[PDB]
Design a protein around this ligand. Structure first.
Ligand SMILES: *[C@@H]1O[C@H](CO)[C@@H](O[C@@H]2O[C@H](CO)[C@@H](O)[C@H](O)[C@H]2NC(C)=O)[C@H](O)[C@H]1NC(C)=O
Ligand SMILES: O=C1CC2(CCNCC2)Oc2ccc(Br)cc21
Ligand SMILES: O=C1CC2(CCNCC2)Oc2ccc(Br)cc21
Ligand SMILES: O=C1CC2(CCNCC2)Oc2ccc(Br)cc21
Ligand SMILES: O=C1CC2(CCNCC2)Oc2ccc(Br)cc21
Ligand SMILES: *[C@@H]1O[C@H](CO)[C@@H](O)[C@H](O)[C@H]1NC(C)=O
Ligand SMILES: *[C@@H]1O[C@H](CO)[C@@H](O)[C@H](O)[C@H]1NC(C)=O
Lengths: 202, 200, 201, 201, 201
């Protein structure tokens, strides 16, 4: 199989509307934010404008091919794939995707999608001009799929990709799993809570 | 039936342009706003910028399937479904949808669509910096369907951002029925009264 | 005929690119602006930001159906219909459509399209802070169809206007105008809408 | 032939990706800007925000029909036509098209496309608040076609339809042809240079 | 072969989702930025707004045709072609493409795509108001293809820079990097562009 055949097969049999659940178990989605820049911070309004790489991984076995005498991986437009319906609960702007909308698909059906996103958030900016800094929390989960359909887990240096030219610096990033049941609904929804501890440079 | 079969059936037969009336009775649409944030307020221009979850429910029997060895619910792109043509009569910006445009469909044909929307409104901002606060009224109804085709009803604060400069004192959501001079038919609306103020 | 059949018939035989002229007569398009809000006014730059409902009516006999055991009217996405190519000659921003892009079609082929539009205009803002107020003129007509293909005709001025605007409406007049350009032998029709408004005391 | 037949024929056989060259000669494109407004000027940054009608004409013989007992002209969405790939070399914003994206096609295959465009330019704003005014030069040519594929030529008062309510007034508009060969490339590229002499009122 | 036949063949067979690797050797992409304008600089936030032509070249042998009695080159919409998935690693806005999205294809399968882009970057603006100026570095490479699939290589200093900018260019250097990240076993190639510029004053 060459690249042309694999990408033809995916384009022709891609059900992008269809969550790829196996034997009624949830799709395991891994999510990790790599912070690249903090552009605007407002301690009065408690708003931040951030650029991050949203590292997103999951398995879709319908994509898989035999890798013997074939590529191990191909680049696929996300319009030809199912992608998790992830949303940031405290976003106050739409995600601005800065990068080409391609994912990497491995021959075993693993998908890696990592867009660069600029987005604005409502979060705690208090203490940004102090030594211990501000802690801005961002919650990301499936908008419509509960824990029996999608599970979200943080992935396996917090400032390795962060811009040296930002007015801000990162003290710490922690990424932890939450499972929440709301009054509306009988089912639990999973989320990754990302805590960005940052401060103004002196 | 698996998810793949249900979503194929819905894509092939859903008729997104066709209001799903039963026996010439109106489609009963429920609408409730959950306020998440108040971002900008201008007492001079009487304008507010708000983020809310627009909880929207209705029945479309053409979507229904036998649930007996099948999923009870699926996620469906709204482009594959009929959705009510709701508009806010006092909006001064287009709705900015912040979330994926998917609805939940139950095997009995019940649809739940709850987008997160950022939108600007013309409303009474007077008293925002006082103890009793401002009361901003938002009217939402069908743009083109009168009360014999679509009825809009409220369902009868909790998720408001603790980090807003503002706080919510009260939200009331009440039904209105309006006849305009132009037109013989009544149009239903939910009137949402947001009583809010600047934090001390 | 039920709604599903009518909307199927319209979607399948809709020629949205084809002006529905009858026997070589112009399509009569009626246009009336209902002002809802005046958001920003600049007396230095002579610019206004306005929200209005653009009530637009015309007949397309290709849409018609026998109403006798059928709905009298349906809601149709404008992407399935011919719509007049109206433009505001003094607009300085694109029309921001705030409402769902549906028109109402009557069984006789009458169409009503009424979008809520926010748009910015170049017009006379002088006198806005005086008792007699400013008069801002907005000209709306077909961008590409002359008077033998499209005629544009006008149909309480403050019945829909926001009580919470910084401005108030004194008067709205909507009158028919005709432009002939040097380039072209044909006249292009427009509705001229005169918005007399002022800052509230 | 009626309008419906002509627009069907154009939709079914228009190759919008195919430049309509005749007998290996260039497509002759005429371009004339009609200035409507000057909205924002910055003498520090040397930037202007302008609204203009970009009158664009060319021949496409593949569109032609016999006009005997048929319309002389139809309105066609530009998505169904080849359009020249014109760009303003000193634009610093994308063209904001304010009008419906329809062209006029004449039965002989002449196309007229005249969008209303709002766009920002890098140009000489020095002297805008003096009697002799500023001269802002805008160059428009094909982005990808050299002079053997596309020629651009200028076409009465270019300023006749300028807004009386602008803070600015037009002193003079000149529109002249340039043909440039760059070091990169063996072929010549044509452009129309438009010089807008304007000042604050 | 005429233009119509070549563009039909490309539209029918191009495979825009398929990287045109030969015998599992990388696609050689050449990238060179031609700086046209520096619009906004902020020494506090270390941000610049720049307009540049992104000269991009590569070979796709599936596009090739016999040039005997045929055009040597055609203009092709990039939606009908594979294009490299290039991104600027320090961009803080999406690329605003100011030009028509057409590439030039030579009969041997060479592609030239040169969009005019306005984009904002995070980079070192310190020293912009001094004689030696600021040096802003921009890194451009494939977002998803490593060095075994795409290689990126640099190809007259600042001849097309706007004379009306508040800034002037002292020097542009464009050098190749090959980077291995901790996450990933493969090396990713990038062109690093160093823009040495200062305020004219
Ligand atoms: C729908 O079409 C029917 C079928 O021909 C029309 O019914 C006729 O109407 C005429 C004229 O009024 C009567 O005198 C005939 O007896 C009817 N014939 C039948 C077979 O019913 C009907 O008029 C049409 N409906 C409308 C609203 O025009
Ligand atoms: O109806 C829902 C579903 C949802 C929507 C947001 N994503 C998780 C699932 O959560 C809710 C939260 C609050 C309310 Br009220 C309703 C709801
Ligand atoms: O024709 C209508 C119907 C509509 C359109 C949008 N609002 C709900 C239903 O209401 C009208 C309001 C004013 C005028 Br005039 C005409 C109309
Ligand atoms: O060629 C035309 C026709 C048109 C163009 C768009 N609006 C109405 C019809 O009107 C013109 C206006 C001015 C000039 Br100059 C040419 C023209
Ligand atoms: O340097 C060039 C070459 C180019 C780039 C656009 N595509 C055709 C070839 O044409 C130019 C047009 C204007 C200017 Br200034 C420079 C140039
Ligand atoms: C993959 O292909 C090789 C080569 O034909 C074969 O030996 C291997 O077992 C295959 N596995 C499959 C088809 O699952
Ligand atoms: C191309 O066409 C010419 C003349 O028609 C001929 O010399 C040649 O064989 C053709 N094929 C190739 C691959 O050059």
């Amino acid at each position: 199989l060459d690249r042309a055949d694999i990408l033809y097969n995916i384009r022709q049999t891609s059900r992008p509307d269809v969550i790829p659940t196996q034997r009624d178990r949830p799709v395991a989605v891994s999510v990790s934010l790599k912070f690249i820049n903090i552009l605007e911070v407002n301690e009065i309004t408690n708003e931040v404008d951030v650029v991050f790489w949203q590292q997103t991984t999951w398995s879709d076995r319908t994509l898989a091919w035999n890798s013997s005498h074939s590529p191990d991986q191909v680049s696929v437009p996300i319009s030809s794939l199912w992608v998790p319906d992830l949303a940031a609960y405290n976003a106050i702007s739409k995600p601005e995707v800065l990068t080409p909308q391609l994912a990497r698909v491995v021959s075993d059906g693993e998908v890696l999608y990592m867009p660069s996103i600029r987005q604005r958030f409502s979060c705690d900016v208090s203490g940004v001009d102090t030594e211990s800094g501000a802690t801005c929390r961002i919650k990301i989960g499936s908008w419509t799929h509960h824990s029996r359909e999608i599970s979200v887990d943080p992935t396996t240096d917090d400032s390795e990709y962060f811009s040296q030219y930002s007015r801000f610096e990162i003290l710490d990033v922690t990424q932890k799993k939450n499972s929440v049941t709301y009054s509306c609904c009988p089912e639990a929804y999973e989320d990754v809570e990302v805590s960005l501890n940052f401060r103004k440079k002196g």
